[PDB]
Nucleic acid binder design. Structure first.
Lengths: 201, 136, 83, 131, 89, 163
RNA sequence: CCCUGACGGUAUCUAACCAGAAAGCCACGGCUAACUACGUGCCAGCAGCCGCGGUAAUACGUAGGUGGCAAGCGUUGUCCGGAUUUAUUGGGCGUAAAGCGAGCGCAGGCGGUUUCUUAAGUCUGAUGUGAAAGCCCCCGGCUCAACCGGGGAGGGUCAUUGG
RNA sequence: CCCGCGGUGCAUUAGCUAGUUGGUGAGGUAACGGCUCACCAAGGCCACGAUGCAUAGCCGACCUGAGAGGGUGAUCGGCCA
């Protein structure tokens, strides 16, 4: 499964945008349902760690088993911290590479582009979105049929291109220069609440 | 203790026991009854039916049965939900779970698994109570 | 004969049988759970060509091959005699 | 009857330390003199003087206190006991209090500190922790 | 009847083989004496690794190859060396 | 000494308690509050006070909590060594941890530990779990932490000679 | 030189057409994330432990909404953890459970200071062995991953010989 | 084939052995040996748990635990019956 629901209730429940600052929390910044505008008392310190974890899980649209295995894998580095290495491994998945490069507006669109077989790493096609893109691998746009309507238009309007992403808008090749850093990556949510959430799992 | 007392006579811990002991059974067919074969459920035939009144301070008439099991030891078992169809000599299935209404009952029958039938109004937790999904 | 057998040491304990003596070899070994060292004993039977050695002697023995239902050792030498 | 003179020495030091006065005397022994020298080298004791008349003893210890009369040894513990002995291997030498305290170990080449033993790579009987 | 034979180590339809010296009564995937090289039927020019200083020692003691092991031991020039050591001295 | 209350301090409620006193006729009820206070930089105090309503109670407690404060040394977001704090049936063990591991600590002790700026530490309560005595035992155990400089000063040595 | 495929026209690759065929289970009084209506009235029923139900029930039964997971979701049974609740690591015996009513003593356990010696315990070096597959570390192949392969470490209370 | 060491409950199970323990010779087996014979003697094992009763194929390994530990011996490999 992935998810198909209204995708905007989700942001109103975390209190974070999740869609490139394009405002879902413009009107009614409160939660969904009857008891939306009428908030109530405090939230535990279990609700806080759960809310941080859900923020990160819904950012990149993955499921709970895969999230937890990625977290367990990031723990075997021991070079740096354990939340930084996590949120950095999270960025190296082929879906974020298409999002950051700029071939798609959303992450759902980028996911459908990499699922339906329209992109290639090093020339060879790769079809599965949880792929692990390493540093220095020019991912391309299937030079067979790169004349599609939405890819073309979403290359023009560059809302955000980062300081670790390289790209050329003629051959349509991009790559990571090097690994990013927390200052360059959502210094807003957390990586410590999420680490504590998995201590008693 | 001194460690010499410990070496003369070691430490011994307490022994734990189930609360569903009639679910580790053995046959009574050829020789005798064997205890290795932990089961999640057992089946049986109900030798009576009816009602009984709870402890202090509850108040009701709670439905129950008495059942003889394949290994030939007898126990009473609660029948849950609203409304059943169980009569003398109908074959049923038991799971663990103890009711806090009266003593002597340590099992539940499972609805919709043999002669017993699922309850016929439910809409909200039909996976218990054994109700199938209605088009409504 | 470049391969070698096992020799031991002990104090003789019984000398009633003809040509056979029981030797107790003693050692200390530890406890598996707790730490301290307990002493441990096992008895061996050894062969005597002429019924020489007596109790309290401190002997050495060596491993041979089955010489009876129970005896597997022979008498090497007497190190220190009792009086 | 007395069965552990090293423990008796250690408890004299701790008892006279907690009441915070500045002298102490014990009957002498070759091992207690060793650990009195080790206690003097690191900075817990101020001095040690050796009188001896007609029996074993004696050994006089001069404790040491801070600038505001606070204590430089804070506790002291006997590890190997007659009744359960504790032997340690060259890679098992302990580090008491993250290096801020010392351990005392008897090896085939002296009664030495725990630094001097993990620099020589040997082990032995563990006498005490003093932190 | 010591042998030099192949031993299957793939998954289901991607086989791999270890070259092994075994008593002939043993099961194909059971006990053996030691392992001597490797062999890969995929990988279009098939891959052989082998020590070839234990093959020459087992061969001179009476071990015997199977039919495929002899083919891949002659493609490596091990049978010629056996030839030049035995019937030449 | 007195760390004087003139800083940027983020308080926290740790417990509240409905407490009665039976009198002629019926029953009286107050509210007791337990509060911690700190700046997440190495200064932490606890304090309690009671009043007839919850806001008044928590206020009097922060009043009390600020009168006491402890220094809490550390060597790079991690406590210098291992301590055991005991106060009346509450026993709490604390260990130095690994860089970026977090705080694995129970309810009362984690409030104390987080408001002093501790980042990586492991704990365990081998005792009772009454909030007041847990807080008091935890503060009792921080007071045993020794700086590396002070030890080198008390003895006749230098640092890098004992570490 | 020449000669052989059960799987099997299998995997796979190319062309056209169509958003059309493909979402459910548990929970929402406190522990523990997620609340309002109506029905019923210590009844019918619910519960892992506290405990709910006698006219305005967020605890029963439905509807609307919300939370957790998702081709699965809950329930029962069995084992380790939390349990320092058999405590070597790591607990206790005045009043909470717990000093035999007291002595005398065989076996056992533990023992003051010191010189020389020994090497049983203790410490240490070298050699042999502790299969293969597993857990772990590095590298590589299946579009990725499960999975598959190559090279290593680890694991003895082990043996022999020298300090 | 022989040997050292290691892995279970019960003392509301303390005595067990008469080819039994040792010697001389004879037969017998691939082979040493009470292995089996005739004679001679009175030995052997046990509180460091003999004997009896109950339960169980053993190991590489597998699950859980911070560790020390605790619980299992299904797929796959080794030994046994």
């Amino acid at each position: 499964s992935r998810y198909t629901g209204p995708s905007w209730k989700v942001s109103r429940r975390l209190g974070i945008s999740l869609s490139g600052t394009g405002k879902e929390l413009a009107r009614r910044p409160y939660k969904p349902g009857q008891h939306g505008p009428n908030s109530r008392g405090k939230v535990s310190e279990y609700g806080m760690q759960l809310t941080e974890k859900q923020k990160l899980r819904h950012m990149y649209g993955m499921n709970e088993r895969q999230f937890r295995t990625l977290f367990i894998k990031a723990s075997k580095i021991k070079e740096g911290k354990h939340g930084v290495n996590f949120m950095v491994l999270l960025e190296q998945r082929l879906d974020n590479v298409v999002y950051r490069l700029g071939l798609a507006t959303t992450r759902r669109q980028a996911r459908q582009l990499v699922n339906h077989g329209h992109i290639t790493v090093d020339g060879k096609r790769v079809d599965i979105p949880s792929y692990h893109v390493e540093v220095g691998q020019v991912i391309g746009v299937r030079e067979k049929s790169q004349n599609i309507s939405t890819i073309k238009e979403a290359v023009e309007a560059t809302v955000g291109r980062p300081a670790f992403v390289s790209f050329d808008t003629e051959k349509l090749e991009g790559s990571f220069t090097r690994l990013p850093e927390r200052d360059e990556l959502y210094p807003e949510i957390d990586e410590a609440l999420v680490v504590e959430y998995y201590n008693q799992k | 203790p001194t460690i010499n007392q410990l070496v003369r006579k070691p430490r011994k811990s307490k022994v734990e026991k189930s609360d569903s002991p009639a679910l580790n059974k053995g046959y009574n067919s050829f020789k005798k009854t064997q205890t290795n074969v932990n089961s999640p459920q057992k089946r049986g035939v109900c030798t009576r039916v009816g009602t009984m009144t709870p402890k202090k301070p509850n108040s009701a008439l709670r439905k129950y049965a008495r059942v003889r099991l394949s290994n030939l030891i007898e126990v009473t078992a609660y029948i849950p939900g609203i409304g059943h169809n169980l009569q003398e000599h109908s074959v049923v299935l038991l799971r663990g779970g103890r009711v806090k209404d009266l003593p002597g009952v340590r099992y539940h029958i499972v609805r919709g698994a043999l002669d017993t039938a699922g309850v016929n109004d439910r809409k909200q937790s039909r996976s218990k109570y054994g109700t199938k999904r209605p088009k409504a | 004969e470049r391969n070698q057998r096992k020799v031991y040491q002990g104090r003789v304990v019984s000398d009633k049988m003809d040509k056979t003596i029981t030797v107790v070899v003693e050692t200390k070994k530890n406890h598996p759970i707790y730490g301290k060292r307990m002493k441990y004993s096992k008895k061996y039977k050894a062969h005597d060509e002429n019924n020489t050695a007596k109790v309290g002697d401190i002997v050495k023995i060596m491993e041979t091959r089955p010489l009876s239902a129970t005896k597997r050792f022979r008498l090497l030498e007497v190190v220190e005699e009792a009086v | 009857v007395m069965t552990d003179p090293i423990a008796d020495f250690l408890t004299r030091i701790r008892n006279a330390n907690m009441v915070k006065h500045e002298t102490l005397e014990v009957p002498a022994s070759k091992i207690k003199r060793d650990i009195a020298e080790i206690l003097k080298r690191e900075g817990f004791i101020r001095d040690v003087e050796y009188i001896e008349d007609d029996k074993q003893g004696v050994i006089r210890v001069f404790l040491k206190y801070g600038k505001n009369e606070e204590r430089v040894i804070t506790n002291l513990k006997r590890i190997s006991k007659p009744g359960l002995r504790a032997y340690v291997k060259a890679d098992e030498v302990p580090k008491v209090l993250n290096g801020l305290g010392i351990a005392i170990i008897s090896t085939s080449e002296g009664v030495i500190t725990d630094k001097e033993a993990r620099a020589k790579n040997i082990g032995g009987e563990v006498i005490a922790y003093v932190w | 009847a010591v042998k030099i034979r192949l031993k299957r180590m793939g998954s289901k339809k991607s086989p791999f083989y270890r070259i092994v010296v075994a008593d002939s009564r043993s099961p194909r995937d059971g006990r053996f004496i030691e392992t001597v090289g490797t062999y890969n039927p995929l990988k279009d020019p098939a891959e052989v690794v082998l020590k070839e200083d234990l093959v020459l020692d087992w061969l001179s003691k009476g071990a015997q190859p199977s039919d495929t092991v002899r083919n891949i031991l002659s493609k490596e020039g091990v049978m010629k060396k056996h030839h030049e050591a035995k019937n030449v001295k | 000494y007195i760390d004087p209350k003139h800083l940027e301090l983020e308080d926290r409620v740790v417990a509240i308690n409905r407490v009665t006193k039976v009198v002629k006729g019926g029953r009286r009820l107050r509210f007791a509050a337990l509060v911690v206070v700190g700046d997440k930089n190495g200064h932490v105090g606890f304090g309690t006070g009671k009043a007839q309503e919850v806001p008044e109670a928590i206020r009097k407690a922060i009043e009390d909590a600020k009168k006491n404060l402890v220094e809490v040394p550390m060597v790079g977001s991690t406590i210098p060594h291992e301590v055991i704090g005991v106060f009346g049936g509450g026993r709490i063990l604390m260990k130095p941890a690994v860089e970026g591991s977090g705080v694995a600590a129970g309810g009362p002790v984690r409030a104390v530990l987080e408001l002093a700026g501790v980042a990586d530490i492991t704990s365990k309560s081998l005792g009772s779990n009454t909030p007041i005595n847990v807080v008091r035992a935890t503060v009792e155990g921080l007071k045993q932490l020794k700086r590396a400089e002070e030890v080198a000063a008390l003895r006749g040595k230098s640092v890098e000679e004992i570490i």
